[PDB]
Write a protein that binds this DNA or RNA. Structure first.
Lengths: 228, 49, 71
RNA sequence: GGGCCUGACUGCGAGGCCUGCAAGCCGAGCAGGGGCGAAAGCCGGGCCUAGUGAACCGGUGGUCCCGUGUGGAAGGGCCA
RNA sequence: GUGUUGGCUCUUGGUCGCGCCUGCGUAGGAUAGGUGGGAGCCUGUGAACCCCCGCCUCCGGGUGGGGGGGAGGCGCCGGU
RNA sequence: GCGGGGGGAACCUGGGGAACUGAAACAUCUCAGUACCCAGAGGAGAGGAAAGAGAAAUCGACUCCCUGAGUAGCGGCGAG
């Protein structure tokens, strides 16, 4: 009845009988873990879909407002003014079909690719073969193609957090900082509640949001009732 | 049932017009055109199985 | 009469049949089976005071026997 | 043989072919709406005479007309 | 199937609830089952040195325990 | 010490209950709950004070006549 984790104390904080609710969560998590540096809490969950038959495979992104600087890099592929807008907006990788060519060669440092409709052909067909089933190629309703290279990369820097059910039907995303206001962690938990809810493919039949919770990096793990 | 199967045209959720059609040569390829009673004429589209 | 019930009347009639369905499913009723039949219960018993019976019929039975069991 | 394109349009038609029934069939021209020329105009399937089937019954895409006190609804009326 | 047609009992299967345990095509200090958080973690072993013992295998190794004691090890870092 | 039973042209209640013919065939359907076997109360029984009607903040036991439409409708929506 004794286990291998010093976290044990934090675990004692952890009383897994209730699934509680969001704001409560902000507070008890914020308290629960501030180990090395300050907790990097995150929320994770699983939906009653079936990602094999991609007719439910979701992803996208809500806009949990709150300053940013880390996670999921992206390539702003376009030309002059777009390099301007998106680069400044908040880009990790920037350029155009020249960057596309560099990638075809041996340079790929971006998980998501967002290109404006001006170098989109070169991006998708030149780099189509390269970014491929990696998730690195631009798609017109996958928050990856369009002129607002600046707007989207911008949010990438000011606050982004995306969605993408993994193999077994679950998503992960940042919806509040560690020492961050409880009500805050609540609100972001929410924006995610919503965009996620929307993504909810019409291919669901019943208890869709099955398990919805807040867990940290290295720390506690408790479900939250995004209802209250 | 033969390379002759019947489809019909419907238009951007704002109507549906009809007419049969086939299967043979370019099979599926099914945009087409037509005009619904939607608005005054309008694309339509066609497809609809 | 010699086989109704004992605890009321359950000895008689029955007109019936069928054919087939497929209605609020795909169509009309495969209609027909002009047939006729019987339709009834069962028998059993207990004791007055050393030496008895019952006879009767099914349910009505069970409640009943309970009743005169009361006496 | 080449280019460009959907009218193989909906609303419809006056007035005739034949026919006792129902059929089937011919169609200028008015409207909305487009497409081939710059246009005088042709296009409401093909070069035409055969590839066809009532009525019931029931399906689906409407519609958003009816609902057996009223709100809705099973269910259902007309369209396709 | 179900109704009178009551009793004790040996048992075996599907299912969902929690707990445990698992994952070796190949470069991969290495049997990475994913996708998340994501450079730090820990001292009732005062340790990865050594000891046996529990368990699962595709030599290896993974995991769970009892002990033996004298600031140590590993995740980082890199790298495949 | 009672009762019944046994009748009775037709009317009558319930008990059980059929082919023709129609649908120019005929299997749903039809004649129909009709013919007929029965049990039985009468001089007539039948029904007979509402878990009714019907939607107006309305009626008011039951029975039989005229009307209610042969409409409302039931249906190989066909004979009917």
């Amino acid at each position: 009845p004794k286990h291998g984790k010093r976290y044990r104390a934090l675990l004692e904080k952890v009383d897994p009988n209730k699934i509680y609710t969001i704001d409560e969560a902000a507070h008890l998590v914020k308290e629960l873990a501030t180990a090395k540096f300050d907790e990097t809490v995150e929320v994770h969950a699983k939906l009653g879909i079936d990602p094999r038959r991609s007719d439910q495979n979701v992803r996208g992104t809500v806009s949990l407002p709150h300053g940013l600087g880390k996670q999921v890099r992206v390539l702003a592929i376009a030309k002059g003014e777009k390099i301007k807008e998106a680069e400044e907006a908040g880009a990790d990788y920037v350029g155009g079909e020249e960057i596309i060519q560099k990638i075809l060669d041996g340079w790929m440092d971006f998980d998501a690719v967002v290109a404006t409709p001006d170098v989109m052909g070169a991006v998708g067909s030149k780099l189509g073969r390269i970014l491929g089933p990696r998730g690195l190629l631009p798609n017109p309703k996958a928050g990856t193609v369009g002129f607002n290279i600046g707007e989207i990369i911008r949010e990438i820097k000011a606050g982004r957090i995306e969605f993408r059910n993994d193999k077994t039907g679950a998503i992960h995303a940042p919806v509040g900082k560690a020492s961050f206001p409880p009500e805050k962690l609540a609100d972001n938990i929410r924006a995610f509640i919503r965009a996620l809810e929307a993504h909810k493919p019409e291919g669901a039949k019943g208890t869709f949001l099955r398990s919805v919770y807040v867990t940290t990096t290295m720390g506690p793990s408790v479900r939250i009732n995004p209802h209250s | 049932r033969i390379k002759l199967l019947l489809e019909c045209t419907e238009c951007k959720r704002r109507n549906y017009a009809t007419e049969k059609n086939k299967r043979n040569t370019p099979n599926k390829l099914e945009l087409r055109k037509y005009c619904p009673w939607c608005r005054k004429h309008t694309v339509h589209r066609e497809v609809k199985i | 009469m010699k086989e109704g019930i004992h605890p009321k009347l359950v000895p008689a009639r029955i007109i019936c049949g069928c054919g087939n369905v497929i209605e609020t499913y795909s169509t009309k009723p495969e209609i027909y089976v002009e047939v006729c039949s019987k339709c009834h219960p069962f028998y059993t018993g207990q004791q007055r005071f050393v030496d008895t019976e019952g006879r009767v019929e099914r349910f009505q039975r069970r409640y009943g026997d309970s009743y005169r069991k009361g006496r």
